[PDB]
Amino acid sequence: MISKINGKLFADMIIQGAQNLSNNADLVDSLNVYPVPDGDTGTNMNLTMTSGREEVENNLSKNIGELGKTFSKGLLMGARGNSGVILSQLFRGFCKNIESESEINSKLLAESFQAGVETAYKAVMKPVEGTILTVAKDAAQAAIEKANNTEDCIELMEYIIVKANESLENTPNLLAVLKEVGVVDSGGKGLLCVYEGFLKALKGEKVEA
Ligand SMILES: Nc1ncnc2c1ncn2[C@@H]1O[C@H](COP(=O)(O)OP(=O)(O)NP(=O)(O)O)[C@@H](O)[C@H]1O
Ligand SMILES: [Mn+2]
Ligand SMILES: [Mn+2]
């Protein structure tokens, strides 16, 4: 059980999320067909997440709000590609939501996923569905619903991942090129990789490098 997430647990979630995305960067690159099939979503997201991870690793804190400012700054100064910019905006909104907190419970975690979705949609001038935005939105809606009756952040994150994966598997039904080529959205897949790392960290586990 995880009732509260402090700054070091959040840092662990960042580090293991980044490692899991790094492990899967070639896989995510291989799916990248939209907007242009230039095969770089995984690399772009990996480089972005790595910039946030390095800032965090060099400036740890027990205070989740302070650690979030560090992570957010690292992403925003290292964003690469459409996918990396969107990832940085998703977590800018997440981190802004907890800026004054030292630790957060499952309800505030869910509210922070939702705040990130709102920030990222506002940052994209013409949002398209079937994308990283769709997956993030469906994950956040799942988070809000589950957290209402679920104190344990491990159980919450497991549910978020189940529902995020259902949304990811549905992305070809929203975006024609995905169904025509036969792939799920690369940006959403990269985000799922980060969320899977989040769960490993909540369990006190490490992603194999
Ligand atoms: N308008 C959009 N709305 C939502 N998500 C988007 C949009 N445009 C791109 N994406 C996401 O960004 C991913 C592609 O990211 P990425 O490969 O990093 O883009 P890019 O290579 O930088 N730009 P491009 O060369 O124009 O395709 C997609 O799989 C979607 O998840
Ligand atoms: Mn590109
Ligand atoms: Mn690309």
From Swiss-Prot:
Domain of life of the native organism: Bacteria
A single BP term in Gene Ontology: glycerol metabolic process
GO molecular function list: glycerone kinase activity
Domain DhaL: 8-200
Name of this protein: Uncharacterized protein SAOUHSC_01193
Residues of the full protein shown: 1 to 209 of 548
